Design a binder for this molecule. Structure first.
Ligand SMILES: CCc1cccc(C)c1-c1ccc(C(=O)O)s1
Ligand SMILES: [Cl-]
Length: 259
């Protein structure tokens, strides 16, 4: 059983500081920091990456002292599957190289399951019966999401509730690692001790992460060939023409080309 780095977070007594330390620790295991373009770290190139460096693990615990372990791909910071008790569940891999890679995860588990659906928001929202804009985020939702993931192992969680719990976890871990802006959005929810759905500025940043990585890494000294439309909090659109405005906003990029 290959050993991958593990980062722990608990919703029991969660604070702005403890959540910040958590996301910073996840960023630090996802990248080396040796490849930066325009002050923005780039994730490792999937091509030639050894299997022993391919994944990191996030162990989540809640007030009920239930624990689940999420596996994240270091090449895109996204969850590929999770372990709860004696079972492990994996999203349907996009290719045969990824199918072979995930056989090295959670190998001491007695029961291995692969879903027919992938981890993308499009299908998860369909299984959940709700769009991201109608699924509240925060410490309360994460606490419930951890319990739902845990009890799927013994049939006590229905699939729509599982899918919604995946959407909560991916946004509060993967997307917060990718964007300081979203990290700050979860901080506000903890500061107010309030749960709320993400507003259009968050959703469009999530939808644009791949396009933003491409536009930045292809840019002529930071200047984009074509503008990228983003959304304000009130839903209105504005255009981004170069990398500078994004430096405080995006924290990780998928590898698109050599530096
Ligand atoms: C997420 C879009 C974005 C990208 C880069 C820089 C900024 C300031 C932003 C804004 C977030 C919210 C805004 C509002 O409500 O008008 S603009
Ligand atoms: Cl292994």
């Amino acid at each position: 059983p290959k050993q991958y780095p593990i980062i722990n977070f608990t919703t029991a007594g969660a604070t702005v500081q403890s959540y910040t330390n958590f996301i910073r620790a996840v960023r630090g295991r996802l990248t080396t920091g040796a490849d930066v373009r325009h002050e923005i770290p780039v994730l490792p190139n999937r091509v030639g990456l050894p299997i022993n460096q391919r994944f990191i693990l996030v162990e989540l615990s809640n007030h009920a002292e239930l624990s689940v372990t999420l596996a994240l791909d270091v090449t895109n910071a996204y969850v590929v599957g999770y372990r709860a008790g004696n079972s492990a569940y994996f999203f349907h891999p996009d290719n045969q190289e990824d199918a072979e890679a995930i056989t090295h995860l959670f190998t001491d588990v007695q029961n291995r399951y692969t879903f027919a659906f992938g981890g993308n928001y499009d299908r998860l929202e369909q299984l959940a019966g709700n769009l991201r804009e109608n699924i509240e985020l925060g410490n309360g939702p994460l606490e419930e999401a951890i319990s739902a993931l845990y009890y799927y192992s013994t049939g006590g969680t229905q699939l729509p509730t599982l899918a919604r719990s995946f959407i909560i976890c991916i946004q509060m871990i993967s997307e917060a690692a990718r964007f300081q802006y979203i990290e700050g959005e979860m901080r506000t929810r903890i500061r107010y001790n309030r749960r709320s759905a993400p507003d259009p500025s968050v959703i469009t940043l999530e939808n644009s992460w791949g396009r933003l990585s491409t536009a930045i890494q292809e840019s002529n000294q930071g200047a984009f060939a074509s503008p990228i439309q983003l959304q304000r909090r009130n839903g209105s659109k504005f255009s981004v023409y170069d990398v500078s405005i994004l430096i405080p906003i995006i924290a990780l990029m998928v590898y698109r080309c050599a530096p």
